[PDB]
Each structure stands twice: as structure tokens, then as C-alpha cells.
Design an enzyme around this catalytic site. Structure first.
Site, PDB file in Angstrom:
ATOM      1  N   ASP A  12      62.795 -31.683  48.536  1.00 17.22           N
ATOM      2  CA  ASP A  12      63.064 -33.091  48.727  1.00 17.22           C
ATOM      3  C   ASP A  12      61.949 -34.072  48.347  1.00 17.22           C
ATOM      4  OD1 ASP A  12      64.070 -35.522  49.663  1.00 17.22           O
ATOM      5  OD2 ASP A  12      64.449 -34.776  51.687  1.00 17.22           O
ATOM      6  N   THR A  13      62.140 -34.772  47.234  1.00 20.83           N
ATOM      7  CA  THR A  13      61.168 -35.751  46.763  1.00 20.83           C
ATOM      8  C   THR A  13      61.116 -37.017  47.625  1.00 20.83           C
ATOM      9  OG1 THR A  13      62.750 -36.780  45.266  1.00 20.83           O
ATOM     10  CG2 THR A  13      61.443 -34.959  44.412  1.00 20.83           C
ATOM     11  N   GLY A  14      62.172 -37.253  48.394  1.00 25.65           N
ATOM     12  CA  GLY A  14      62.210 -38.423  49.253  1.00 25.65           C
ATOM     13  C   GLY A  14      61.484 -38.224  50.567  1.00 25.65           C
TER      14      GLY A  14
HETATM   15  C1  LIG Z   1      70.469 -39.591  51.990  1.00 24.85           C
HETATM   16  C2  LIG Z   1      71.359 -39.187  53.131  1.00 24.85           C
HETATM   17  C3  LIG Z   1      72.815 -39.091  52.662  1.00 24.85           C
HETATM   18  C4  LIG Z   1      73.376 -37.805  53.163  1.00 24.85           C
HETATM   19  C5  LIG Z   1      72.242 -36.776  53.208  1.00 24.85           C
HETATM   20  O1  LIG Z   1      72.012 -36.267  51.897  1.00 24.85           O
HETATM   21  C6  LIG Z   1      71.087 -37.727  53.589  1.00 24.85           C
HETATM   22  N1  LIG Z   1      69.791 -37.155  53.204  1.00 24.85           N
HETATM   23  C7  LIG Z   1      68.728 -37.231  54.023  1.00 24.85           C
HETATM   24  O2  LIG Z   1      68.607 -38.075  54.911  1.00 24.85           O
HETATM   25  C8  LIG Z   1      67.630 -36.183  53.764  1.00 24.85           C
HETATM   26  C9  LIG Z   1      67.706 -35.056  54.796  1.00 24.85           C
HETATM   27  C10 LIG Z   1      69.046 -34.361  54.804  1.00 24.85           C
HETATM   28  C11 LIG Z   1      69.505 -33.670  53.682  1.00 24.85           C
HETATM   29  C12 LIG Z   1      70.732 -33.014  53.742  1.00 24.85           C
HETATM   30  C13 LIG Z   1      71.493 -33.058  54.924  1.00 24.85           C
HETATM   31  C14 LIG Z   1      71.029 -33.759  56.047  1.00 24.85           C
HETATM   32  C15 LIG Z   1      69.806 -34.423  55.977  1.00 24.85           C
HETATM   33  C16 LIG Z   1      66.232 -36.806  53.859  1.00 24.85           C
HETATM   34  C17 LIG Z   1      65.855 -37.766  52.730  1.00 24.85           C
HETATM   35  O3  LIG Z   1      65.935 -37.058  51.499  1.00 24.85           O
HETATM   36  C18 LIG Z   1      64.420 -38.297  52.858  1.00 24.85           C
HETATM   37  N2  LIG Z   1      64.510 -39.567  53.592  1.00 24.85           N
HETATM   38  C19 LIG Z   1      64.607 -40.742  52.717  1.00 24.85           C
HETATM   39  C20 LIG Z   1      64.688 -42.058  53.462  1.00 24.85           C
HETATM   40  N3  LIG Z   1      63.594 -42.122  54.418  1.00 24.85           N
HETATM   41  C21 LIG Z   1      62.684 -43.127  54.444  1.00 24.85           C
HETATM   42  O4  LIG Z   1      62.666 -44.030  53.607  1.00 24.85           O
HETATM   43  C22 LIG Z   1      61.672 -43.147  55.526  1.00 24.85           C
HETATM   44  C23 LIG Z   1      60.843 -44.335  55.744  1.00 24.85           C
HETATM   45  C24 LIG Z   1      60.231 -44.606  57.036  1.00 24.85           C
HETATM   46  C25 LIG Z   1      59.700 -45.868  57.302  1.00 24.85           C
HETATM   47  C26 LIG Z   1      59.061 -46.112  58.522  1.00 24.85           C
HETATM   48  C27 LIG Z   1      58.984 -45.055  59.441  1.00 24.85           C
HETATM   49  N4  LIG Z   1      59.522 -43.868  59.161  1.00 24.85           N
HETATM   50  C28 LIG Z   1      60.124 -43.611  58.007  1.00 24.85           C
HETATM   51  C29 LIG Z   1      63.579 -41.032  55.385  1.00 24.85           C
HETATM   52  C30 LIG Z   1      63.418 -39.728  54.590  1.00 24.85           C
HETATM   53  C31 LIG Z   1      63.353 -38.574  55.579  1.00 24.85           C
HETATM   54  O5  LIG Z   1      64.358 -38.259  56.223  1.00 24.85           O
HETATM   55  N5  LIG Z   1      62.127 -38.002  55.670  1.00 24.85           N
HETATM   56  C32 LIG Z   1      61.832 -36.926  56.604  1.00 24.85           C
HETATM   57  C33 LIG Z   1      60.336 -36.582  56.455  1.00 24.85           C
HETATM   58  C34 LIG Z   1      62.093 -37.407  58.044  1.00 24.85           C
HETATM   59  C35 LIG Z   1      62.670 -35.682  56.276  1.00 24.85           C
END
Ligand SMILES: C[C@H]1CC[C@@H](O)[C@H]1NC(=O)[C@H](Cc1ccccc1)C[C@H](O)CN1CCN(C(=O)CCc2cccnc2)C[C@H]1C(=O)NC(C)(C)C
EC number: 3.4.23.16
Lengths: 99, 99
Positions: free
Chosen positions: B25-27
Site C-alpha cells: 500500500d503506497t497510501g
Molecule cells: C480507499 C478505501 C476504499 C475501500 C478500501 O480499498 C479503502 N482502502 C483503505 O482505506 C486502505 C486499507 C484497506 C484496504 C482494503 C480493505 C480495507 C482497508 C488504506 C489506504 O490505502 C491508506 N489510507 C489512505 C487515506 N489515509 C490518509 O490520508 C491518512 C491521513 C491522516 C491525516 C491525519 C491523521 N491521520 C491520518 C489513511 C490511509 C491509511 O488507512 N493508513 C493506515 C496507515 C492507517 C493504514
């Protein structure tokens, strides 16, 4: 372009004639944008992230330019921390992971 | 290798002798794994994303094998629905985004 991951992979996207910052997210199945006005009807969608589920509005066939690469697809709008470009649009611009 | 985004970029990782499936995961800024026992001292941390914040246990200097490639770094353990390999470890294996 080749993008390293020492920093957040933020790029500029153009949607509706506006420039915005978006995160290239390979762990996101969908593209989720912060609250904005998009044309047409919308359908309901529930998406699950790290903290749980949220309700978003889905718009279809929206034109969005990512780094000079035009893509047309489904965009979800809701309470997201940042604009997220997911796999649905990453595949359209030919993005891959390499190591 | 070169990984396409038609499907979720899942890979096999080995941590603590255990083989697990994780998402590249690049995000994700950090690496978060589903509840498990890791040796050493940990610190409470709060991480957030889509859906809000979750409480995790922070373990530093943990070794992980992502497709043979060894990487050392901080891994958070908690109530995540998917094992996530974030940017902190992706950089160590020379992972890059191309398009
Ligand atoms: C995009 C969604 C649509 C449907 C799913 O595909 C879903 N994907 C996701 O959510 C995936 C996880 C997942 C994959 C598959 C099934 C379930 C869950 C995580 C995402 O790629 C990364 N994500 C991006 C947005 N983020 C930010 O901007 C944080 C900024 C910020 C600011 C201030 C304080 N704190 C944080 C949070 C960050 C995140 O979650 N990072 C950690 C370290 C916690 C993992």
C-alpha cells in the site's frame, strides 16, 4: 514517471477545471474525493477503511486528469482525509508497482 | 517483479516465522498488521484513516521478509481488517510506482 516512496505519492489532478492534490493509493480499491459538486445523479455506496465504514456518493463517468493522463471513471465523494486515487483509475493510466 | 493493479497487490510476507498475506500500500505511511504477538516492548499509538482512528501497539525494529527481500522497521499491531505494508517498509525493498 517513476515515483519513489520516501515521501507521500501526491500528484496534481484536474477535475472540473480545478487543480487538486491527490494521493496515488494502491491499497485503495476505489477513488474517493473530498466533498465537491459533481454533475449528474449519484448512487449510494458504503466503503470500509481502517477505522470502519463511511457512506459516500458515487458518480459515474467523471473525467479526471492525473499528471497529464486523462481517465474517465467512477469517483466516490465523501468525508475522506485526502483525495485518494485508487486502483480503478490507476489501471487506466497504466500504473504498476515495481521492485 | 512488476505488479499490475487489476487486482489487489497482495504478497506473501514472513514475520516471526509466520507466513502471512499482506497488501502493498503506497497510501499507507505505516505498516499495520492484524493482532499478533511480537517480542519486545511496545508503545500505544493512534492511527487514522477512512472510518476514523484505531488504537495500535507500536513495535520498533522488526524484521519482515517481503518476497525474499528483508526489511527492518516499525510495525503496528492492531484491529486492522487487512495486513498493510506501508511506505516505511516499501522503500527498503526498493518499491516504486511507474506510469
Ligand atoms: C480507499 C478505501 C476504499 C475501500 C478500501 O480499498 C479503502 N482502502 C483503505 O482505506 C486502505 C486499507 C484497506 C484496504 C482494503 C480493505 C480495507 C482497508 C488504506 C489506504 O490505502 C491508506 N489510507 C489512505 C487515506 N489515509 C490518509 O490520508 C491518512 C491521513 C491522516 C491525516 C491525519 C491523521 N491521520 C491520518 C489513511 C490511509 C491509511 O488507512 N493508513 C493506515 C496507515 C492507517 C493504514
Amino acid at each position: 514517471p517513476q515515483i519513489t516512496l520516501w515521501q507521500r505519492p501526491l500528484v496534481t489532478i484536474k477535475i472540473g477545471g480545478q487543480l487538486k492534490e491527490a494521493l496515488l493509493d494502491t491499497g485503495a480499491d476505489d477513488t474517493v474525493l473530498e466533498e465537491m459538486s459533481l454533475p449528474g445523479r449519484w448512487k449510494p455506496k458504503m466503503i470500509g477503511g481502517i477505522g470502519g465504514f463511511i457512506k459516500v456518493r458515487q458518480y459515474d463517468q467523471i473525467l479526471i486528469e492525473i499528471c497529464g493522463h486523462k481517465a474517465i471513471g467512477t469517483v466516490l465523494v465523501g468525508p475522506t482525509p485526502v483525495n485518494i486515487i485508487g486502483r480503478n483509475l490507476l489501471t487506466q493510466i497504466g500504473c504498476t508497482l515495481n521492485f
